[PDB]
Amino acid sequence: DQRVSMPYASKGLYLETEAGYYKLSGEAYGFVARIDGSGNFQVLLSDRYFNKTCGLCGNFNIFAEDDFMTQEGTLTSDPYDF
Amino acid sequence: ACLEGCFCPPGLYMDERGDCVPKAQCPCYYDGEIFQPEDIFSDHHTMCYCEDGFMHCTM
Ligand SMILES: *[C@@H]1O[C@H](CO)[C@@H](O)[C@H](O)[C@H]1NC(C)=O
Ligand SMILES: [Ca+2]
């Protein structure tokens, strides 16, 4: 809850700005997040989690049709209830 | 038909406890089962919830 300043680098997470746009790097944990001025979340994620992860950005597999596997794990046709 | 009796205004729907309520907390009776207005609910294979009085199942 304590508002901190920026940049900020605690716990192996470097919270920096790049090209006038804000970045959060977690290279130790294998990800890079950022935001632009307009507000557009982006997540670059390492192939280590290939067919490991599952969330709102789908699984990191090759297929692009099966990546709605719910928190239980259910291929749901709907992009909404998922 | 167009019957005669004790109703309550159309914004309100009849609850089991003698009060009538808006459809927000109006429970669901899926399989008869009286689901509370917010009940997330599912086998491995089905997936079901009670929204507003209707029970939204899927598979
Ligand atoms: C992903 O891993 C599961 C086991 O957790 C396996 O059954 C499935 O075939 C794998 N799929 C890919 C894309 O490698
Ligand atoms: Ca996918």
Which of A68, A71, A72 best tests the B interface by mutation, with the highest count of B CBs <10 A? A72
Quote the CA–CA distance of B13 and A23 in Å, as a whole number: 51
The CB density around residue B28, as the number of other CB atoms within 10 Å, is: 21
Mutation to probe ligand 1, out of A47, A50, A51, A60 (largest number of atoms < 8 A from CB): A51
Q: Which of B55, B57, B56, B59 is nearest to B29 (CA)?
A: B55
φ/ψ of residue A12, rounded to 5: 75, 15
3-state secondary structure of A41: coil
Quote the CA–CA distance of A73 and B14 in Å, as a whole number: 37
H helical segments located in chain B? none
3-state helix, strand, coil in chain B (%, to 5): 0, 35, 65
Q: How far is A69 from chain B (nearest CA, A)?
A: 12
Q: Which of A56, A58, A72 is nearest to B46 (CA)?
A: A72
Query: Using the 8-state DSSP alphabet, how is residue B23 labeled?
Result: T
